[PDB]
Enzyme design. Structure first.
Site, PDB file in Angstrom:
ATOM      1  N   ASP A   1     -14.958  -5.019  74.135  1.00 25.61           N
ATOM      2  CA  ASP A   1     -16.217  -4.419  73.709  1.00 25.61           C
ATOM      3  C   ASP A   1     -16.441  -3.070  74.382  1.00 25.61           C
ATOM      4  O   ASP A   1     -16.439  -2.968  75.608  1.00 25.61           O
ATOM      5  CB  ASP A   1     -17.387  -5.358  74.012  1.00 25.61           C
ATOM      6  CG  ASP A   1     -18.734  -4.713  73.751  1.00 25.61           C
ATOM      7  OD1 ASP A   1     -19.375  -4.256  74.721  1.00 25.61           O
ATOM      8  OD2 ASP A   1     -19.152  -4.664  72.575  1.00 25.61           O
TER       9      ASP A   1
ATOM     10  N   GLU B   1     -12.558  -2.247  70.778  1.00 25.41           N
ATOM     11  CA  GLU B   1     -13.499  -1.985  69.704  1.00 25.41           C
ATOM     12  C   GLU B   1     -13.923  -0.541  69.923  1.00 25.41           C
ATOM     13  O   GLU B   1     -14.922  -0.254  70.585  1.00 25.41           O
ATOM     14  CB  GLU B   1     -14.703  -2.928  69.775  1.00 25.41           C
ATOM     15  CG  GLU B   1     -15.462  -3.027  68.462  1.00 25.41           C
ATOM     16  CD  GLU B   1     -16.401  -4.221  68.402  1.00 25.41           C
ATOM     17  OE1 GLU B   1     -16.941  -4.492  67.307  1.00 25.41           O
ATOM     18  OE2 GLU B   1     -16.603  -4.889  69.441  1.00 25.41           O
TER      19      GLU B   1
ATOM     20  N   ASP C   1     -21.448  -5.787  64.098  1.00 21.33           N
ATOM     21  CA  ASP C   1     -22.246  -4.606  64.378  1.00 21.33           C
ATOM     22  C   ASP C   1     -22.625  -3.839  63.102  1.00 21.33           C
ATOM     23  O   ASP C   1     -23.359  -2.848  63.151  1.00 21.33           O
ATOM     24  CB  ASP C   1     -21.449  -3.696  65.312  1.00 21.33           C
ATOM     25  CG  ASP C   1     -22.313  -2.674  66.013  1.00 21.33           C
ATOM     26  OD1 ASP C   1     -23.508  -2.557  65.672  1.00 21.33           O
ATOM     27  OD2 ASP C   1     -21.796  -1.977  66.911  1.00 21.33           O
TER      28      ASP C   1
END
Lengths: 485, 485
Positions: free
Chosen positions: A210, A240, A323
Site C-alpha cells: 500500500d 500499489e 480505491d
C-alpha cells in the site's frame, strides 16, 4: 544478476476481494469467543448476529471463485484494526477477529492451496493507527517513551483524538489517525521486515504494498525484496503505485505494480465519453479524456516500452480497485464498455485482475457505502459469461499471457493488435465506435493467418495471397473479437 | 462438595518478583527484533542497550532463588503494556516484548519447572488500557463501535487523553487510563475466562487476582474457579484483597487471598512504635497502632478463626508487596523488627511470601522510584541467613506448615504459641520488648516437651513434672526462638 519475476504470476488471473463485504459463512461460527458455550451464545449478541464478511465465507465460496477461473486472490488489509478502518493497523501479527483471525485465515489458506490458488495480502507499512502498541506507548508515556523516535513526532503535547489542537506528529495525508513511521530508523526497518517474513513463513504467496512510494528511506524496498525472496523465491511483490513506477521496477525491488497506467487509457478508449466522471478516481488514474484508436495505441505502446519485459509479464493489470468506482458503474451502465475493457485487460501482457463484483456487473460508487455487494444473483449473466469465456481463452492460449504485443491497425475507433508466442499468433480487434467498422490491414508481420473466431463474432475475415499477406476486417459497432488457428 | 485447595500451595514458599526491576540477562538478547542482524545491532540503540529487567534475567538467577529455598515465584503484571504501566494492559495474549515476550517467558517457565518451582501470574481483569484493542475500536468508532457496551461508557464525546474535558467513561478510581470493563456483559465474562484458560494451558501454575473485589457481577469468580480448575485442578487462585475476604472464601471462588490481615498486626506487634508511618501503606494494611502480645494474640486468633481451615492452609501470608514499602524500610531500619516479623510469617499457617529484596535487607520506599533493587551484595548477610535458615526449618518441620495454631502465653511484650501436627509439636516465642523477658507457662496442652533450640538462642528452657507440665522461658530483648524435639 538477470531480472527474475515469479513465473506463476505470469500465468495467473487475480481476483481482488474485500473480505469484510464479500461473504459471510453459514454454519455457526465462534467468531471471537472461540471457547464459548453454544448455550450462552444467544447471550452474546455481537457474535450471535455478526453481519459483515469473514474469511470463512471466502473459503466456503472457493467453488465460485475457481469456477470463474481465477487462480489467485488478493485482499485489502485484514490484520487487526478497528471496524471499517482496516488501514489503521492495530496489530500486524493478527488477522482481525471479526474476519476469523489467524485460525480462519489459516483454513482459507490451506483450502485455497489444495485447490492450487495463491493468496496475496495487503501490507500497510507507511503508517499504522493510534492503537498500534508502540505508538500507544508514546501516547501513554509522552516524551519519556522509549519509541518517540519511531514516529515523526513534531512537538508536545499531542492531541491524537481531540482535533481543535495540534497533534505534534505527522499523520499520513495530515491525518491524526494514521501515525506515520520513521522508516529511516533502522529498528523500524527491522520490525517491518519481520512482519513480511512472518506471513511468508505463515505460508502466504506474496505482498501487495500500500502506497509504497511514501516510504523513501533509501535501500528499503531492495532489502524488502531480499528478505522476502529469501523466505520464498516465488513470492510476489506488488506495489500499489498509480503512475510511472520505473523507480521501483529496476528488478531489485518490486516484481511489478498495479498497472493503473493501463486502466486509464483502456477506459478512456473503451468507454470514451461514456465515462461517468464523478466516480473518478482522479487521484488514481486518468480514464479521460476519450481516446481514439491511434491515441490509445501510442499511449499503450508508451506503457509497454516503459519497464523491463520480465516485469511487464508480472505487472498486475486492472480496471477497478477498492480505491475506485466499479467498472459497471464507471461506464454509466454501458455493457459494451464493460465487455470491451475486460477484453483488453484479459488480452494484455501481465497478470489480469478482476475486482470482485465486476464479473457479475455489480455496481460500485466511489464513496461511501454507495458500495456494497456480497457479490446474490443478482448478477449480469451476459457480462459474467464474457468474463468466464475470456478467462478460459487466456488460459487456453499462451500468447495472450506471455506473447509479444504488436499494433496492426489503429484508425478512427478501430484497434487491432497481435499477441504472438512462438508460432502461435492471435489477432485482437476492438470497434470502439457506434458504427460497424471495417479495416484493411497489411499483416505482413504475421507468419500465419488467424481466421477462426475464438470469440467476438466479427465479419470480413478475408485474407489472401501468401507472398505478402493482406487482411480485411469488419466488426459490428461496439464490439471486439479474437482470431486464431 | 467438601472444600479443596492446592496441596502444593500448603507447603510452598512464595517469592514475589517485580520482573522489570529484578534482573537483566547477560549474553546478548534479541530483545524485540528477534530476527535481526548482529551487525545492525549497534544501529538499534533501544535494543542494544536496554536497561530494566527481563524474564531472561530471572531465569538466569534461578540458582539464587532456589538457594534461598523458595519453590514458587509470582510476579506483577507482565503482559503487553506501555513502559512502567504494567497495569494498563494492552494485550493479554502477549508477554511484554521488553521482558522477552512469550518466547522468553516460555523458557523461564520450563526452566523453573524442571527445578520444580511453580509460577503464578497477576491477572488484571477489572480494567485495561486505552490501547486495549476493543477500547481502541470504541475510541476509533465512537457511538458506532460494536463494543461500546463492553465498557462503562457515560456519554459522548470521550476525551481519553486531554483531561480538561470529561471522558464519558468510567476509569478505575476515576482515572482515564484504566478503562473499566462491563463485567456484567457475558461476552466480557467469556473473553476473560478465555484469557485465564489460555495461560493455564500455556502451563502456568495459577492466577493472582488484582483488585478482584471490584468485579461484582454475581457468579463471576465461581465460574472463574470452575473454568480454571477444569484446566488444572492444582491451579492456585489468589485474590489480592486487603481485608475481610470471607465473601470470596467459601470454597467456591478463591483458594485464598494475600493475607494483609496478618501483615498489619504482625508489624504492629513485631515493630510497634518503630513503624515509620510514612511508608504505610494505609490503604493496604493497618500495621498500627503498636500491639502488645495480648492484643496481637486476640487479633491473630480472630484472623485464624475467620476462614475455613482448608483455605487458611492456602492463604498467601506476607509482610510486604509491590504496593507497599519494603520491610527493612517500614521498620525504620530496625533489624530486630525484620527478624521477628519474618519469624512469625515463616511459622504461620498458610503459604509464606517474601517480596524480592527483603531477604537481603534491601530498602523500599512507598512511592515513587524511591524503590529500586536488582536485588548486588549489596545485601544484609545477617538478615539473609535468618531468611534462609527459617525457610529450611519450615521445610524441615511439617507442623509449621499445616500444624495447628495455639497461643500459650501472651503478656506484656512476650508471645508464645505452638504449631502441632500429629505428635510433632513446636513452640515459638517472641520477645517484642527491649528487656530480657521470662514467662512461666502452663503447657498442659502439649503431649511432649520441646527443649532444643532449633533457632533463636533463648534461655530458661526449664520444664519439670509430667503429670502436669510446667514451662519457664526466658528470651533476650527483641528476640525469638523455635523449640523442638
Amino acid at each position: 544478476m538477470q531480472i527474475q519475476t515469479p513465473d506463476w504470476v505470469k500465468h495467473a488471473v487475480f481476483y481482488q476481494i474485500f473480505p469484510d463485504r464479500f461473504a459471510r459463512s453459514k454454519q455457526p461460527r465462534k467468531r471471537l469467543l472461540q471457547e464459548a458455550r453454544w448455550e450462552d451464545w444467544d447471550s452474546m449478541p455481537t457474535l450471535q448476529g455478526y453481519k459483515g464478511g469473514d474469511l470463512w465465507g471466502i473459503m466456503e465460496d472457493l467453488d465460485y471463485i475457481q469456477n470463474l477461473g481465477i487462480n489467485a486472490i488478493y485482499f485489502t488489509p485484514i490484520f487487526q484494526s478497528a471496524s471499517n478502518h482496516r488501514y489503521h493497523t492495530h496489530d500486524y501479527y493478527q488477522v482481525d477477529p471479526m474476519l476469523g483471525g489467524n485460525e480462519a485465515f489459516k483454513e482459507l489458506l490451506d483450502a485455497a492451496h489444495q485447490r492450487n490458488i495463491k493468496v496475496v495480502l495487503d501490507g500497510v507499512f507507511n503508517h499504522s493507527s493510534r492503537g498500534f502498541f508502540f505508538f500507544h506507548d508514546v501516547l501513554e508515556n509522552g516524551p519519556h517513551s522509549p519509541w518517540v523516535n519511531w514516529f515523526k513526532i513534531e512537538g508536545w503535547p499531542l492531541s491524537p483524538y481531540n482535533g481543535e489542537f495540534p497533534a505534534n506528529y505527522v499523520g499520513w495525508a495530515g491525518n491524526r489517525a494514521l501515525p506515520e513511521f520513521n522508516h529511516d530508523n533502522p529498528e523500524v526497518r527491522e520490525y517491518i521486515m519481520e512482519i513480511a517474513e512472518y506471513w511468508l513463513k505463515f505460508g502466504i504467496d506474496g505482498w501487495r504494498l500500500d502506497v509504497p512510494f511514501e516510504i523513501k528511506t533509501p535501500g528499503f524496498w531492495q532489502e524488502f525484496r531480499d528478505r522476502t525472496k529469501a523466505i520464498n523465491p516465488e513470492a510476489y511483490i506488488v506495489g500499489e503505485v498509480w503512475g510511472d513506477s520505473r523507480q521501483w521496477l529496476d528488478g531489485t525491488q518490486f516484481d511489478g505494480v498495479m498497472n493503473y497506467l493501463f486502466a486509464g487509457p483502456t477506459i478512456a478508449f473503451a468507454a470514451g465519453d461514456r465515462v461517468v466522471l464523478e466516480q473518478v478516481q482522479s487521484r488514481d488514474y486518468q480514464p479521460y479524456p476519450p481516446l481514439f484508436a491511434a491515441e490509445y495505441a501510442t499511449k499503450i505502446q508508451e506503457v509497454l516500452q516503459l519497464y523491463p519485459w520480465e516485469i511487464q509479464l508480472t505487472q498486475l493489470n486492472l480496471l477497478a480497485s477498492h480505491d475506485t468506482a466499479r467498472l459497471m458503474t464507471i461506464a454509466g451502465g454501458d455493457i459494451a464498455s464493460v465487455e470491451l475493457s475486460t477484453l483488453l485487460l484479459l488480452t494484455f501482457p501481465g497478470a489480469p485482475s478482476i475486482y470482485y463484483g465486476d464479473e457479475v456487473g455489480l455496481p460500485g460508487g466511489i464513496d461511501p457505502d454507495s458500495r456494497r455487494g456480497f457479490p446474490e444473483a443478482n448478477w449480469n449473466q451476459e457480462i459474467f459469461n464474457t468474463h468466464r469465456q475470456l478467462i478460459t481463452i487466456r488460459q487456453t492460449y499462451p500468447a495472450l499471457r506471455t506473447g509479444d504485443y504488436q499494433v496492426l491497425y489503429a484508425q478512427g475507433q478501430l484497434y487491432l493488435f497481435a499477441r504472438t508466442l512462438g508460432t502461435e499468433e492471435l489477432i485482437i480487434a476492438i470497434n470502439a465506435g457506434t458504427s460497424s467498422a471495417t479495416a484493411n490491414v497489411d499483416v505482413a508481420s504475421l507468419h500465419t493467418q488467424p481466421n477462426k473466431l475464438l470469440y467476438g463474432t466479427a465479419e470480413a475475415e478475408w485474407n489472401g495471397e501468401e507472398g505478402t499477406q493482406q487482411l480485411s476486417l469488419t466488426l459490428p459497432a461496439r464490439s471486439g473479437c479474437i482470431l486464431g488457428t
